[PDB]
Amino acid sequence: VIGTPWQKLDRPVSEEAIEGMDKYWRVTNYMSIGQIYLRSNPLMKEPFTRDDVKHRLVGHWGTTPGLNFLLAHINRLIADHQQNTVFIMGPGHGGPAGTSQSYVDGTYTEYYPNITKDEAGLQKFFRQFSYPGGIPSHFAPETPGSIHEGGELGYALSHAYGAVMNNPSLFVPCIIGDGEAETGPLATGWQSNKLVNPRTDGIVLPILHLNGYKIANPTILARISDEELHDFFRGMGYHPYEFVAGFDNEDHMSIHRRFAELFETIFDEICDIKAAAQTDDMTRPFYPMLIFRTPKGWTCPKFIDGKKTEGSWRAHQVPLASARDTEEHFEVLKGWMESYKPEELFNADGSIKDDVTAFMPKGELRIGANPNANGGVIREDLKLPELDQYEVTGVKEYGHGWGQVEAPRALGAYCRDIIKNNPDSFRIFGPDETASNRLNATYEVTDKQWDNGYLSGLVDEHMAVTGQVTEQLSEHQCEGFLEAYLLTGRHGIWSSYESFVHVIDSMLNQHAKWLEATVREIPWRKPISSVNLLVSSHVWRQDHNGFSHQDPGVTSLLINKTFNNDHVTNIYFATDANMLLAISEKCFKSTNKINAIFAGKQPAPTWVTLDEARAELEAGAAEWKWASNAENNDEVQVVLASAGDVPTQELMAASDALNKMGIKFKVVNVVDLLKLQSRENNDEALTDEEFTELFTADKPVLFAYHSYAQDVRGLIYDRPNHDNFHVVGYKEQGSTTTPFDMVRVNDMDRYALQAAALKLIDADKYADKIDELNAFRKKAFQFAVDNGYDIPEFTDWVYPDV
Amino acid sequence: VIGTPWQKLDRPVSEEAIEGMDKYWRVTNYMSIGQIYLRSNPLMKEPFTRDDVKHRLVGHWGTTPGLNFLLAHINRLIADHQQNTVFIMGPGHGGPAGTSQSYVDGTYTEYYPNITKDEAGLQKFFRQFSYPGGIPSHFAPETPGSIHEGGELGYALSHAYGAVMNNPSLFVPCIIGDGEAETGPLATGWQSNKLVNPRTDGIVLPILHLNGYKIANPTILARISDEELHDFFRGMGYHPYEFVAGFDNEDHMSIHRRFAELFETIFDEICDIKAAAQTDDMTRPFYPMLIFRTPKGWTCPKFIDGKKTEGSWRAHQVPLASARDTEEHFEVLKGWMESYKPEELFNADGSIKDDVTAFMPKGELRIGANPNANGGVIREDLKLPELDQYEVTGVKEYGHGWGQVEAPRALGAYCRDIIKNNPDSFRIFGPDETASNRLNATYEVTDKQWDNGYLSGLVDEHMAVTGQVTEQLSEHQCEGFLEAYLLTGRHGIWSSYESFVHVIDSMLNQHAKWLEATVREIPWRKPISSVNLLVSSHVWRQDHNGFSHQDPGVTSLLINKTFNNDHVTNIYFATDANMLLAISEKCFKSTNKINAIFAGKQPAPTWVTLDEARAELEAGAAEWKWASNAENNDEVQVVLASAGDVPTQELMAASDALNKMGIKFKVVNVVDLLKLQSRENNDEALTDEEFTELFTADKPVLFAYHSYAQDVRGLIYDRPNHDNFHVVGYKEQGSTTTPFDMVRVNDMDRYALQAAALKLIDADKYADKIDELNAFRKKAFQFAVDNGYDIPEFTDWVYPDV
């Protein structure tokens, strides 16, 4: 247990804590200006001149003094209440407030010992910000206290609410840009309070950083009427509180005492909710939220060159951009930095004075030290059930190609038992598609968590106020809740229709960037559990939905996060349920990855046994020798290779026909796609030797790919024999139609694959046969048009091993 | 002018209009069930049996009777008020309601003459729905009345509000799923009423289709308290009205008269707002919105096999899934279809009776006929200013490589004059980045439109209640507002930081799917203006922001919409301002495309004159003969090729050094990326002959690519000489650092490009020189680390032609 959660003070905030927070706000504003502007002379010691100013002024002042004021007060709250706390910096461009926080709390020098608490360390700390060889301008993963960089805005609320799930002792003050609140993902993030339980989850306090402006415009929420702004928050289930300061001549000590009093009223309401939830965990409370309305750039010069800067969008990035180049801007910078009175905040040796930090929390309650902001320190491996009990044993009993299993059901049973063994640390998220993607075996041991109105057992099923599955129709919510659930040390999986994974392409990009920077250079940030995404209800079988639902291209996005032997991204094609089991175990043991797990939810054959899946998964691609009919590679006339459930079923039927014609081939199944890349691009890929053993040195290779052929063409560009591959993939053809027609129109059906194999072997010899196969594809299409189902010769085919 | 806009009735709705709407609702519910369930016998004529039921039951009933009821009432409104109207079907899976609407209004048989108004046409209409060789299950572009398919949910509101911009006569009732309202893009779409003006724009009426459920869960908005739901809408600037029906035994005629009365009160409020805005166009009104709370699946069987189906998520997809297979489900289907009393709705010949449609609008006011739902019928070409006045004439006057122009400023001036010449039909959208991306020359002739609070001329600049630029910090809003502005017949452009274009990858996928289906098979849907996106503030120069802002990969997404010689997608690399001008003119003349226009906003050289840009753009890739030093292709030792402003600047400096060494090369610039694909993949690409003329038949090619190398490797896989290309691209390296360091760490700097050229020519001979160049890259990096700016030898370089 960290601290003493949800305790009220029952005395006023002390005057010493008020004095300490004003000194914090002054020193963190002074050091944030020093990080943006100074390359030397951090204490302005004689002579202080333009030569001490950076030659490239980069970074963002406007948000920063607001964040520094909130951080003084959240620090005071943590210390006085001993409250386990992680904050979220929505305006992540306020990086200097997050680095200043960790430098004051002492974690900065603990994690970066060269950056010491004295004049030399402070000089290094100022220069390194947003500087070559230095550190980022945002609240990046290399800053203690960060689980959210806030560069791509929108995800502050889903991260906050995912951090509190199953974390009943944790408070998260979530600071949200008022410009960020104009994004789609932030606007739906406020609704998450219908999806957490005040007994079994922790508490988010949204703090809208309503400083009036974004980069070059006012914000929508700051300029609507105050009545509308409070109705809006009350309508989303909050009790809004509003604080306004800095627009008049109120002295800063008075401002701190009024804010401390308000924050204590808010925290007491949060403690009342937490106490009441011990008894009534079914009534959803109106959780507090705070509208914090202060001038953008607060405390900077009111006008610069005749233009209003404090209280304007003009304060967003770098005011005084000529500070190194003109004596006029320099004297303004000098007066601005002097206004914080640093001679009162630092000792002669350059260390921040004890009276500046006496009010701060200590130990693991410090924002920079709390293990929830470095969740791999808390993470334990999952207690996994043995995988063999889930195996589809039909392949062993009856043969390769057996049955009509819906593959994700085996993963549903495996996840049900992972939840039973890990009942508060593994969650499932889905955008109203957990049952549609066939993971509903999980409801045998838990419920979908819904903290909103119930009506009747005739409609509400598998649903309760606490539970380990969460659904909302928003891929941004599912991906963001899971990312923070992992960042805080826990585990989970989500599923999405494949075409709609694209809604969250950019969130995958950012969490991959967070992993890239972590595995490269932040070894104190310990490994977290991977993002596991079941990508299902895929392009080949959108029977009720059609063309808008046909887009497997998240493969191509994921390929753009495969560099530097970081190994943070995996793309897996589950050939059947036993392959899906073997991939899922590997994913659930893995850390520091995004694992995209492709699997079809339609009834489909099972190709391999579980032991076979385990071996083939490790290599990444495998010959299926029981399907190949060639003696050796030299007798091969064509290599039949596939990745994906439906391309594999059509390739296997093509193999059956080609065997019956007397054609010699081998069959290669591909599961771990990036293992096709060269070793020069991927030091864990097949070697050239192993790749040539599979694909041959010089025989044609027909490759039936689940996604866009471009992916495979690009990945194998420097591989031996790559000129001999013919990659057939989805090609933006399809609608609501029958299973055969959907593969027919992308030349992926068994008949077109058999024709393409013959064209690669001898197009002249097999010209008539290729025409007969193309005519059969037309007869089977007319059959579907006339009859309303596919030709039995297509539907009824079973691999002959069965 | 269409109809008589914004007119009140000042009499009650007639009883004949009530009788007509109930007959519409019955016939459209009956035909929607017929589209999902029947392959023959649409009038249930003796014998009606299981053999008339489809063998594959696909499609979605639950939303559909709600939409059919709203469409009866919107049709009655249009006819009685003569109101120019386009609706939006947010729950686009209710396709059978949109096809039934067009079949009743008569547009279906006008556009599809085989689908006649009689028993044979009705049989064909039932069978073809969601059927092989037939039509989609959603409200696809091939349905008259659609500008929004609604397959990927979320975009109903941004499309509605973009359709009304500069369309002051147009009413848009926007029907929004209550599950769809849980998405990010829909949640921020409600805020668009701060961005339209009630005098100069038209009026959206949001209608929340609050049927209680999504696929397998209740919805957040249906289960929060009613007080919260109305506070929420009032807080977002609406006057909420709520209608509840179908949960008790109220007869349907009574329901229609109560709804007609409410819809008239709402429409009168909208007419009051429109009249008042003629005089006061600065006070933002509280626009009506309608909460429409009815049971999901309304009018279907209350229980099926003991499970509650009407008023449940169970009604979402296909109830009675055994209708063909068991006599029990069949008799339920038979009784359900009989309950609409089709013998009263159709004549003996199968035509819908006159008394069913006498209340409907006629002519171009019909939902299926209105030209705003087929905007290419209204679209006129833009009146474009002559391009030569914008040319950067420095290349002609002083030489190739001249100056420090910020390229988008030339496009800003060109757009300013396009707005002046087309003052109500060309808009700019940006997510608070129009000025940051250097398009603010537009504010010389218009303002950013902001219909929300003003405070002071010291902060509000270039901003007014009417104007032709729109900014909100949401890429979903900008892309959705523009898509509908184009779909309704107008023109425009938006700009985004490159990394964040990814937020709307999935919207690009869907608008490309809408274009694919239109150019393939819907020739009555006339060409619309293209989506033009300036992709700027790119990966090489995110000086204030860093690694989260470094992701040029929308190239790779766009490559997955390049099939079938549809030619709906273009990827352009603007080498400099004159190239950007030539690309922008081509884009602004183009139709039926998505044009992604890559350009850097940093000060940069200008390489080509405007006439040169015009020629080179047409071919797609061009030799720069003034930069090449080789006699002919056979004397070339390496081809130096680049795509993108910064790769081109570094390649040109590498060319200068290589010339000075005595190395023979040629320089090829690539602007129209997909023109590198083979003709077999793209019938408008360079031919093999033209491609070999540029890249040689067998010399090494060093290709400095702006984005991820994978893209170029995949596109050239079947091109002559492709094995000799070495593609250098971004590789997930970088942070907030200097311009040289950012290209250094991706091996893109001039020194690494010169080294790679030497390694391709003779790695043994030039081993020492390659070491010297790699050491210089380390000295220039240490220089930046020590001094805080790049080495003058790097920054001060100018191509020697200048």
Ligand SMILES: Cc1ncc(C[n+]2csc(CCOP(=O)(O)OP(=O)(O)O)c2C)c(N)n1
């Ligand atoms: C998704 C996304 N779109 C665009 C941007 C570009 N951008 C960086 S800061 C910023 C304005 C942020 O304004 P606000 O949230 O109000 O922050 P503050 O005023 O506290 O600086 C924008 C538009 C972004 N970072 N993320």
Ligand SMILES: Cc1ncc(C[n+]2csc(CCOP(=O)(O)OP(=O)(O)O)c2C)c(N)n1
């Ligand atoms: C962005 C997105 N995510 C997921 C889906 C999958 N899906 C199709 S319908 C649907 C439920 C829609 O519920 P609602 O909007 O309430 O529509 P209605 O109840 O009127 O059928 C979902 C989850 C989708 N179509 N779009």
Ligand SMILES: [Mg+2]
């Ligand atoms: Mg702001």
Ligand SMILES: [Mg+2]
């Ligand atoms: Mg619904």
Ligand code: NA
């Ligand atoms: Na090759």
